[PDB]
Amino acid sequence: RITLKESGPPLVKPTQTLTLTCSFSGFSLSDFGVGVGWIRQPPGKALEWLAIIYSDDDKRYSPSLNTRLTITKDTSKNQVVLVMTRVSPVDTATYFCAHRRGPTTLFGVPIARGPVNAMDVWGQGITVTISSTSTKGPSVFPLATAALGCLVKDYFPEPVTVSWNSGALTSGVHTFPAVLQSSGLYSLSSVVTVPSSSLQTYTCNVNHKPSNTKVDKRVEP
Amino acid sequence: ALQLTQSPSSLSASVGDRITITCRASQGVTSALAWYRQKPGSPPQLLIYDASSLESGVPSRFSGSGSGTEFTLTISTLRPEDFATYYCQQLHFYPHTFGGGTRVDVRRTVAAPSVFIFPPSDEQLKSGTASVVCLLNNFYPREAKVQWKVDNALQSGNSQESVTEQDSKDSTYSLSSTLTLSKADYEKHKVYECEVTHQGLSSPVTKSFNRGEC
C-alpha cells in the first residue's frame, strides 16, 4: 500500500524560501521509472502542476515557475523535497505530492506504459499561506425576511469561529469562507436570515484562538 | 502552450442520472490522459488512467473514452459521493497540464437570490475604513454576478466576494460581496448600489442606499 504525506511550514513570508517535504512509503525512488510529482491548488481554484522527479533522477519543472523551483529526492529516506524561492501571496495554496507509476515490467522487461498515464496516489496536502502578517485579532462590525450579520475583519491567521446566540441559533445562518485581503489579513462575514417579525435578540459570538480574541456583538435594526 | 479545456465548467444533476464531462486538448496527447474526482477538503482521486483504463478499486460506473484531442468521462448512474469537482490531466507533454475542472452539484428548481445591502457601521468608519457589503441569499444555480456602483460609477478592483458550499437541505448557494473604501473616499459619494444578475431574475435587481441620508 502506497502513502504519501506532505510536511512544511503552514506560514511563510513574501520573498522568503519555502521548503516542502514529501515522505512516502510503499515504494522506493529506486524502483524502475517511478515518479513523485508536486501539484498545488489555491483556495477555491484549479489544480496546477509544479514539478516531478523520477527514480533515475530525471526532473522536470513547470516552465512558468522553473526559475524558483528545485526538486530533489533522498532515496534512502523515501522523501522528495520541493524548494520554492521568493514566494509571494499568490503562492498560497494547498500543496500536494503524488506518486506516478513506472511502466509495468515482465521478468524485468517493460511491457506496458499505460499505467504511467496518471498520478495514482496523492498525499492529503499541506496548506501554505504567504503573508507578511503577524498574529492579529479581528475587529467585529455589525451588518444591520430580514437579514443581519457580523463583519469579522482584519485578522490573522485563519481560522476564526462564529456562532449565533451562543450556538442556539443555527437555522438560516451563513458563515462565508474568509478572503485573504491584499493587506495580508483575512476578513469574513456571517449573516443570518430571520422573519422580519422577530427583530428576539441576535448576537454573533466570535472567537479567534490564535490571538485569544473573543467577542460577542449584539446586532439590531 | 498546451490548452486543456473541460466542458461544461459546471453541471447540475440528480442521484441516478448519467452524466458526461469532456476534456479537449489544443494538441494531440494520444491516450495519455487521466480523470480525477475531488471532494471538498480532500486530494483528487484517480478514476481513469491512460484514457479509458479503470483504476483498481474504482466503481465500474465510471468510464472514460477518446484519444488525441477529445476525451470524455461518463458516470452511468450518479451516486451521492459523486457530487464533486472533476479534473482531467494530460501527461503526454511537459508540463503535465490539468483542466480547469467541472463542478457537479445537486440540481433543484431555479431560485433567485434575495438581495440585501449593508452600509458600513459608524464604528468601522471611526477607524478610517468603510466596508459596504452585499448579500445574495439562497439562490440556484451557483452562477451569479455582482456589480458595484457608486454615484453610478462602475467599481472595479475594490471588492472581494465569497460563496458558500451548496446547502445540504436547500441545495442553494449564498454569496457575500464586500466593497472596501477609505473613509475619505466613502464620504465623497452618496449612492451606493449593488447590482445583481442571476438566471432567476428576469432582469437585474439593484439594492442601494444614500449615504448620510437620514
Binding site: 515518479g35 522536470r60 511502466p103 498515464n117 | 498546451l2 494538441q27 495519455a32 507533454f93 511537459y94 503535465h96
Partner: peptide, 9 residues
Amino acid sequence: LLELDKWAS
C-alpha cells in the same frame, strides 16, 4: 516546441 513526456513515443 512542447517537450514530450518521459514515456512518450
